[PDB]
Design an enzyme around this catalytic site. Sequence first.
Site, PDB file in Angstrom:
ATOM      1  CB  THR A  11      -0.967   0.033   1.203  1.00  0.00           C
ATOM      2  OG1 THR A  11      -1.949   1.056   1.018  1.00  0.00           O
ATOM      3  CG2 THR A  11      -0.229   0.274   2.509  1.00  0.00           C
ATOM      4  CB  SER A  80      -4.010  -1.127   2.515  1.00  0.00           C
ATOM      5  OG  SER A  80      -4.587  -0.549   3.668  1.00  0.00           O
ATOM      6  CB  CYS A  81      -4.307   2.185  -0.933  1.00  0.00           C
ATOM      7  SG  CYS A  81      -5.021   3.143   0.424  1.00  0.00           S
ATOM      8  CG  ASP A 208      -8.384  -3.574   9.031  1.00  0.00           C
ATOM      9  OD1 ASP A 208      -8.101  -2.443   9.480  1.00  0.00           O
ATOM     10  OD2 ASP A 208      -8.018  -3.979   7.897  1.00  0.00           O
ATOM     11  CG  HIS A 236      -4.840  -2.647   7.942  1.00  0.00           C
ATOM     12  ND1 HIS A 236      -5.938  -2.809   7.133  1.00  0.00           N
ATOM     13  CD2 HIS A 236      -4.044  -1.744   7.320  1.00  0.00           C
ATOM     14  CE1 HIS A 236      -5.815  -2.038   6.067  1.00  0.00           C
ATOM     15  NE2 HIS A 236      -4.679  -1.373   6.162  1.00  0.00           N
ATOM     16  CE  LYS A 237       0.404  -2.587   6.824  1.00  0.00           C
ATOM     17  NZ  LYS A 237       0.048  -2.036   5.495  1.00  0.00           N
TER      18      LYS A 237
END
Lengths: 258, 258, 258, 258
Positions: A11, A80-81, A208, A236-237
């Site tokens: 990301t 993510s992004c 998350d 999140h990771k």
Amino acid sequence: MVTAHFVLIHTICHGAWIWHKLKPALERAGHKVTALDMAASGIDPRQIEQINSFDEYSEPLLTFLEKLPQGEKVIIVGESCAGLNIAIAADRYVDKIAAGVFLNSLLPDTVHSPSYTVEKLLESFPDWRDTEYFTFTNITGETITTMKLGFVLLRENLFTKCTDGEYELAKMVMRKGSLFQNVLAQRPKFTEKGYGSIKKVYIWTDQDKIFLPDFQRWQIANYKPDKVYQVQGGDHKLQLTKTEEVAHILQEVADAYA
Amino acid sequence: MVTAHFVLIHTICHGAWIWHKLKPALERAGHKVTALDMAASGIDPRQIEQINSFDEYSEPLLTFLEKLPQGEKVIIVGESCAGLNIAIAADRYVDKIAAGVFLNSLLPDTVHSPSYTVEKLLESFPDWRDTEYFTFTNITGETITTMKLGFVLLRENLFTKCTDGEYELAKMVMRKGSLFQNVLAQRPKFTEKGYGSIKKVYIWTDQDKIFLPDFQRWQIANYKPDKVYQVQGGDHKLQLTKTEEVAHILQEVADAYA
Amino acid sequence: MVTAHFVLIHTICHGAWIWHKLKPALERAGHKVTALDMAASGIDPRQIEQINSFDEYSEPLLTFLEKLPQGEKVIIVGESCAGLNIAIAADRYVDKIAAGVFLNSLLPDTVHSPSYTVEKLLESFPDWRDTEYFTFTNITGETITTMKLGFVLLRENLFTKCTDGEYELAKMVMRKGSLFQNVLAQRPKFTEKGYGSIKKVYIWTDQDKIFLPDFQRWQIANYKPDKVYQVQGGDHKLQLTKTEEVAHILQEVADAYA
Amino acid sequence: MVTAHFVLIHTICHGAWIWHKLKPALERAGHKVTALDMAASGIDPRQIEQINSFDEYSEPLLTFLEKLPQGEKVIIVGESCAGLNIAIAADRYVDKIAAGVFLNSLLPDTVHSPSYTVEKLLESFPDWRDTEYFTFTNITGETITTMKLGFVLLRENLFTKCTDGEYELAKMVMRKGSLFQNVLAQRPKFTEKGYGSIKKVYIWTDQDKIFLPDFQRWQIANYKPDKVYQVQGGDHKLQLTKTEEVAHILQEVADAYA
């Protein structure tokens, strides 16, 4: 089982380094893995201020696909992004992509503007805490907003359950990034024949603390993936907190899309 | 129990990231820790080809010491080639340095040229295997040899007993470096009043597959450190393989000198 | 009479020094003058080999405009190749530029590639005499051609009718430069809304021995400037051979665009 | 009438450029002229922070003499502080120097420390007005004081009667410099057999507003030159204000000693 070539896409702000646990894990199963630095990310020599759009930021991925031998197909995994990179790449190289895998990731669609899922993310998570923001003027005069992720956000929201070694690693190599959101907003919609026609697998956890549950549920609902995998626990990771589990899931993706 | 400010200095090609495990370990003991990127290393924006000597390469360390508040002292910990940075910094900022710690590191002296311990290293370990070498002309016309460390060397010689995740990390963020050996050769010797007068603690293992036993024993013999700690097992990167043990040694250093 | 803020932009290889006569001339008329060194030019500490494009080379001009107070406007005067800097800057900061003044200068357009006028220049003037050429590989792997201007070319083609002092000055402070032509070639076109919409004033002489008459006439024809001034006599470096006349012209530019 | 090879040595902060008028003047008369940039001066790529003493600063002069063909002799002309370069060079290469010429210059001796004439200068001219001072720590831990000459000092004290073009030129290309005074203080004295044995010609004006009359008179008294030429009028920079007269004097020096 089936072996495959995974291309791992980090990301914004981050780098290929983020995959340092998942890459060998997959390779233990006999897969080929490439982890790329996007522009001005990881140890890429470019600075963010010379990058003008999210397409330009994606260049290493597009150059990689371009040079990919015909007849080879890759599975692109994005955190993510990086879903935005997956969408962009798929609109140029659909026939080289066996599937796209979304790991706590933005899940763009073909019906709304490219910026849509970004707007929604910021709607659900507007406060990025001790993150600092900067600006520069890009080559056609658009003000671009870059960010330096705050260490508290890193600790509590991104790397929540990661070891101290991993969190500390993140501070030692994190760079600036940008959503390029105002430029995304003006960008043509992702096409049905490219991005829309790839297989899409969505992996996430409800633990998350930045891509929140309602938001991820909303994404799944907005644009139905071919398969959804939910992983218990972690943060999140997941490529750090749930490495082996994510590896296994990626095996099933390989088995399915081959 | 004493607390201290450790400044951690990576080797050429590498970066602050190499300390990602040792930094928090020390912080668990209440210490202050700074891990710096040297020029054109880790995520420093400079490229190696604009750097003209080992003194210039050291600039972030020297700038950090320069700005260190008057009356504060640090303990500088250096791995591998970073003993050169320690020597260089000590000649400029002797009063800001409580001790220098050498971790499987080059141990320079005041009697020989600054290049001496480098010559001896290459004497003991001449073959760097799949490492690639490049060349550029520096601003005063000296040809500078840069290197890109080979993965096999990384795997077998540097990160021998490290996890796969660490070794893979290393490939994702390794940069070019240089010994600047021919420029070191013409450099004035390290002074007694600076580098020679700091406390020196030498930590090593005989399992090191690039800084070999006879070479490290020779270094200890050539220039006697105030205290020598030998760690059983591990590999060249003890800050990864023997993190807790190295932390605990660094505490004894703090106890003695901080 | 109207006063203004002129920003003077030298050509590749050269530096702010080139304007040492014209700057005080204008100041006699009450104007504000800024003469900037572009990257790796004049006494800018950067070396050309760390510069990767003509946009990067233009950084001091862009940083200057970026920091210019909202609502202030400047007139940018560019000699020779500096028209490219004008075009680049104007695409980013159109509202801060009252006009662009082109002094024996490249005059880029919006319909062709940014490299177009450079191609045509080299078409008309392909032999740069005792000029020496070098190469380096930039941060994304493009070969860049740099040049060291030959003294004969300096004497006969650039500084033709300048005093011996001025010519001699030029040899004492000239540096390397690059057209970055292959990188210009790949660059997006200059926009109508930025560069295209600034006022453009073209000043030249037919006695120019490098930007030759047919070439300059061709530029005027290719892309009509709002006003053209032709100065009799002089040479390529009118800010030296025709200082007072150029000053008086720049006054009319100020009077017009204010 | 005799021809000679003059080597022109600028003062700290300045550069070869300072001789842009005098160089062609002398060449009119058939002389050979070399104007060198000292380290971190003019357009020399080194920055002042990498330079550790006035001997290091002098390197281009010493490299030039070293490569001077055996049996050739030069006349070294030095302005302002460059007398120190003359003294240093003469102690290495006495047989290659027909004479030293001092132009409103420091005039060092063999009886006192190298720093002596500097101390006296600062005694007579202690206030350097809008000059800014910076500091760095050199390779052996000495604090070095560097300066950026103030524009008012430039205008009124150095370039007093120079044209506006010349003064302006100076602002466009001036760099930082240092007296290295504390390091000069520790330096071995200039030897009688080298510096002390060269012929010495002192050229000055009483209209100098920084190297003041009593100070220059004192220098002549402290260490008698073989010949003293006083030029009426002008300012500190006689190579700009009294170019032709200085050229003609330098001819007589050639006639006497070349």
